[PDB]
């Protein structure tokens, strides 16, 4: 699934993601669109070996299971699979552990680089929030 803005936003609140660990919705909004363009399916390989699944770009090396990635753990408890489903809830759920972790959305280097101290607002403006 490609979501919209307003779409994304709108399922991103309602799990409960809107103010999660003090992050204001645009923050997550800003973040996917980098990570991901709003593609549920998106699967990018890092240098490393692992590989980083759905909206959040998520990565194997920690927080998933692909079975493909030597040393690696699965602190979320899902199959990495689960991350690329049109339904967000594994996503988001694994998101709100990764941000819990101590760095805040900087475990997010796209967030850092593209999103960190700008006018995240502007990405839920015009949205029925
Ligand atoms: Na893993």
Redesign the pocket.
Known sequence: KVFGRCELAAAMKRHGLDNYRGYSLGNWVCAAKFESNFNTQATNRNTDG?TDYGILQIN???????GR?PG???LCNIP?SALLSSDITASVNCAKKIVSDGNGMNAWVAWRNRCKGTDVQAWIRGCRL
Request: aromatic share 16%; with cysteine.
């Open positions: 692992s194997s090396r920690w927080w998933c299971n692909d990635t690696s753990r699965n990495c």
